[PDB]
């Protein structure tokens, strides 16, 4: 019996920790209102860590917006009526170049 | 129609201003 007494105890602590995460977030969210009414650098302070990830994109020269975002939802909103509608490929760096070139028996490498 | 006359006469004796909406509500209140 002591096997499930301690198993269910640790199982409950895992989901009690998850419950406190969602509870505490809704608690801190009470002071945050109208993101449109905060300055740029203050909104990043509420969402601590976004400035760090923004520096990672800059220092690695990943300055293609939304390249490392799995769902670049901002990229889809910007290209709703674009010609050749496309979003950047995942983790595309502006410096990489995978171009190849071959010589065949025919012209133009065909 | 007959229940309308019963309520109207009661409201008549108390010289209280009555409307058809009040009577319809009171009659509906009796059946309800």
């Amino acid at each position: 019996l002591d096997d499930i007494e301690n198993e269910l105890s640790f199982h409950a602590a895992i989901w009690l920790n998850a419950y406190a995460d969602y509870t505490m977030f809704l608690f801190e969210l009470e002071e945050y209102n109208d993101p449109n009414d905060y300055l740029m650098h203050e909104n990043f302070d509420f969402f601590r860590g976004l400035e760090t990830e923004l520096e990672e994109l800059t220092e690695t020269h990943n300055y293609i917006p939304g390249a490392k975002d799995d769902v670049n939802l901002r990229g889809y909103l910007a290209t709703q009526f674009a010609w050749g509608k496309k979003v950047i490929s995942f983790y595309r760096h502006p410096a990489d170049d995978f171009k190849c070139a071959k010589a065949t028996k025919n012209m133009l490498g065909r | 129609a007959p229940q309308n006359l019963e309520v109207e006469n009661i409201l008549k004796r108390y010289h209280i201003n009555y409307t058809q909406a009040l009577i319809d509500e009171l009659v509906d209140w009796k059946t309800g």
Binding site: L1, D3, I4, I14, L29 | -
Partner: protein
């Protein structure tokens, strides 16, 4: 409407008050002032809707080890529980019911 008045009185039409006070200060606040870049005691709002993961059991052990009863729970689970993960998910009562029929025989 598209006819709000003269150019000089344009910043007048923006204010909307929640009280009955007169005269009304016209200026409509754009942003919240942030004079000092103070580190907020508030936790980050990024920790919003992340599913269950390894950080949940790692932090559970850290907080459980703050108690005497919690130290016994952690030690028994990490040693004497045949599971291939610490992310325990209860999807059936097999391990629970079989532990009761093996116990209530006395």
């Amino acid at each position: 409407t598209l006819q709000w008045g003269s150019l000089a009185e344009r910043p007048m039409v923006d204010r909307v008050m929640s009280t009955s006070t007169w005269p009304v200060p016209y200026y409509q606040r754009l942003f919240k002032a942030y004079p000092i870049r103070e580190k907020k005691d508030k936790m980050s709002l990024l920790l919003s809707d992340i599913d269950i993961d390894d950080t949940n059991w790692y932090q559970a052990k850290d907080f459980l080890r703050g108690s005497f009863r919690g130290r016994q729970i952690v030690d028994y689970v990490e040693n004497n529980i045949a599971s291939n993960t610490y992310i325990l998910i209860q999807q059936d009562v097999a391990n629970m019911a079989k532990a009761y029929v093996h116990d209530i025989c006395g």
